[PDB]
Amino acid sequence: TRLKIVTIHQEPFVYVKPTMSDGTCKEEFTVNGDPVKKVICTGPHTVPQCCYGFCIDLLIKLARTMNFTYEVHLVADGKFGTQEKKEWNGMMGELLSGQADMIVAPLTINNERAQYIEFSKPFKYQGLTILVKTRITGINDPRLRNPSDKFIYATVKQSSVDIYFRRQVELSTMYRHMEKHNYESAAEAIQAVRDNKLHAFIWDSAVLEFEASLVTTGELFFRSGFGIGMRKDSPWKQNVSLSILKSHENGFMEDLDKTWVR
Amino acid sequence: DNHLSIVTLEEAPFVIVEDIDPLTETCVRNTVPCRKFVKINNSTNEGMNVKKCCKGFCIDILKKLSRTVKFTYDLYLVTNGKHGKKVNNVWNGMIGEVVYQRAVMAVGSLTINEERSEVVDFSVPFVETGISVMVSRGTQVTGLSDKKFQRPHDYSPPFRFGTVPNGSTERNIRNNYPYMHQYMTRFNQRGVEDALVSLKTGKLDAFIYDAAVLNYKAGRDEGCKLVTIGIFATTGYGIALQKGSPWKRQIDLALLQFVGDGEMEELETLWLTGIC
Numbered sequence: 001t002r003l004k005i006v007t008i009h010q011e012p013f014v015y016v017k018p019t020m021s022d023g024t025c026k027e028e029f030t031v032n033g034d035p036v037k038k039v040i041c042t043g044p045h046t047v048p049q050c051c052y053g054f055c056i057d058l059l060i061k062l063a064r065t066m067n068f069t070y071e072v073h074l075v076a077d078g079k080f081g082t083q084e085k086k087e088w089n090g091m092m093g094e095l096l097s098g099q100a101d102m103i104v105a106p107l108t109i110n111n112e113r114a115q116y117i118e119f120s121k122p123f124k125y126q127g128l129t130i131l132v133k134t135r136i137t138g139i140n141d142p143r144l145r146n147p148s149d150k151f152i153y154a155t156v157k158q159s160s161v162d163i164y165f166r167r168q169v170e171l172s173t174m175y176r177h178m179e180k181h182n183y184e185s186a187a188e189a190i191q192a193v194r195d196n197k198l199h200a201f202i203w204d205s206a207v208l209e210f211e212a213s214l215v216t217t218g219e220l221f222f223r224s225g226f227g228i229g230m231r232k233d234s235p236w237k238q239n240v241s242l243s244i245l246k247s248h249e250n251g252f253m254e255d256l257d258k259t260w261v262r
Numbered sequence: 263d264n265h266l267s268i269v270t271l272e273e274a275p276f277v278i279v280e281d282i283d284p285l286t287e288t289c290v291r292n293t294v295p296c297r298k299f300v301k302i303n304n305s306t307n308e309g310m311n312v313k314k315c316c317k318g319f320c321i322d323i324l325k326k327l328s329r330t331v332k333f334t335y336d337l338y339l340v341t342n343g344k345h346g347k348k349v350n351n352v353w354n355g356m357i358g359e360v361v362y363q364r365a366v367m368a369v370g371s372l373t374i375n376e377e378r379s380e381v382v383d384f385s386v387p388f389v390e391t392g393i394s395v396m397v398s399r400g401t402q403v404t405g406l407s408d409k410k411f412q413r414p415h416d417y418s419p420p421f422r423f424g425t426v427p428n429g430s431t432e433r434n435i436r437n438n439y440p441y442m443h444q445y446m447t448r449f450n451q452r453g454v455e456d457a458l459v460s461l462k463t464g465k466l467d468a469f470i471y472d473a474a475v476l477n478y479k480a481g482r483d484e485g486c487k488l489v490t491i492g493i494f495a496t497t498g499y500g501i502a503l504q505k506g507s508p509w510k511r512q513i514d515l516a517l518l519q520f521v522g523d524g525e526m527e528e529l530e531t532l533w534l535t536g537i538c
């Protein structure tokens with residue numbers, strides 16, 4: 001009666017590291033003296049690996065609140081889920097196909113996904129920030145609003161940010177400057193900011209507040225939240241949201257933020 | 263039928279109530295009609311329905327939802343309570359207006375918490391908020407979870423902080439910190455304006471209230487002296503419906519659609535801007 005939980009490699013939400021020689025996972029500890037709770041997560045050859053982090057801790061607490069058993073596995077194709085006559089890939093496809101009963105991952109809540117699956121109440125709220133080595137007010141700063149080659153800024157090409165920036169007409173002149181400067185991966189752009197070929201990198205705030213530990217600038221823009229992904233026929237999902245609301249109010253989500261994000 | 267009974271509650275900048283133009287008797291510019299039941303005297307409970315004019319962030323959210331989901335409404339202001347509190351196992355306010363089938367949905371600065379979700383269905387949250395702390399410049403606390411709040415007498419002199427009761431904020435403090443809560447009752451503020459006046463004049467060391475309203479109040483403070491710190495118990499504003507209404511599925515799709523269209527920041531770019 002185990003829940004097939006699917007997740008994805010995305011720090012600081014879900015760290016995955018190889019097992020030791022004996023098949024176990026090294027016992028580490030938080031900044032506070034608490035021990036890090038880890039779970040085995042098969043995935044890509046498919047070998048058992050070590051999963052821990054925000055969503056894992058949330059999974060453990062969720063697994064104990066409503067009392068269920070779970071088996072965690074990384075998503076095969078390594079995608080979050082897009083509409084590619086149209087069929088989902090990534091964790092979206094694995095949830096709808098039946099390979100997973102529930103998605104515990106930093107999965108953005110949007111309209112297209114809600115027409116097939118159904119999210120819980122948001123367990124994490126965030127948006128977008130700017131990563132510079134410099135002052136920037138945010139998306140409304142004049143140096144991005146009126147682009148020049150004196151201050152370069154972009155994002156990952158075809159990324160969730162790039163796909164949305166093109167989608168908006170108001171950001172046409174701003175996005176056209178980015179399209180000529182977009183990079184292949186996130187690690188390339190963050191290195192471009194460090195090696196002084198990119199002056200700003202628009203990306204997810206949690207990934208950039210984490211990578212700074214380079215400093216974030218301005219207020220966040222284009223807010224987006226993460227929810228627990230399930231099918232609309234899931235009997236549990238009612239209390240899945242109630243537990244997310246419960247953990248927000250009793251301070252549990254704050255402890256998760258202090259342990260992983262701050 | 264497609265005519266919906268929708269309740270709201272005034273709280274700038276999300277729901278603003280303006281008096282009707284005497285003649286023309288029409289709501290002008292970015293405005294919808296909204297009626298408020300006003301009593302004649304205190305001897306009896308007899309009154310009249312004053313048709314007024316409503317605007318704001320949540321009002322625009324209502325108009326676009328009425329446009330995308332395609333429905334009409336008779337908007338009115340709740341006069342029995344405010345946002346919603348369960349008094350003697352009987353919900354009042356906007357929540358009560360939905361629970362007892364006097365309003366098919368509620369739009370406004372309605373915080374999504376667990377206890378309200380057990381009696382109404384909330385939509386996808388469309389305005390991020392929670393419980394923040396507003397102080398004057400120089401005051402040093404880390405937030406609601408600070409031990410200067412949990413144990414007020416542990417510090418000298420004791421901090422002076424309060425909240426607007428009956429809402430979701432005082433409710434959350436009541437179950438999380440029973441000592442802190444029954445210490446705040448001495449400093450209870452009748453309104454949000456009364457709270458910030460007390461901060462600037464120096465009778466209140468901190469104001470614990472909804473993060474969305476505080477972030478807006480901190481944005482337009484005269485001289486930019488009132489500041490928010492840092493959100494505890496992060497949640498959001500949600501459109502509450504009755505348990506199992508047909509419209510809950512459609513509203514979540516329309517709200518989520520406004521995000522992908524750049525319409526959501528389009529309204530924050532309009533209503534929630536701050537000078538500070």
Ligand SMILES: Cc1ncc(CNC(=O)c2cnc(CNS(=O)(=O)c3ccc(F)c(F)c3)c(C)n2)s1
Nearest residue numbers: 109122223224225226386387388389390521526530
């Ligand atoms: C003071 C202000 N905060 C937000 C404002 C405008 N609203 C949005 O930008 C927005 C963003 N995303 C979503 C859908 N995903 S979500 O997980 O439910 C989510 C995430 C972050 C949020 F901030 C939020 F509200 C909701 C929705 C429905 N609305 S104004």
Ligand SMILES: Cc1cc(C)c2c(O)cc(C(=O)O)nc2c1
Nearest residue numbers: 010080106107108160204206207
């Ligand atoms: C924490 C995080 C970070 C990134 C970089 C995400 C992303 O590119 C896509 C998506 C997505 O579509 O769910 N989610 C992300 C979540």
Ligand SMILES: N[C@@H](CCC(=O)O)C(=O)O
Nearest residue numbers: 345372373429430431472
């Ligand atoms: N927004 C709150 C009311 C004000 C507060 O308590 O912060 C609610 O809907 O319950």
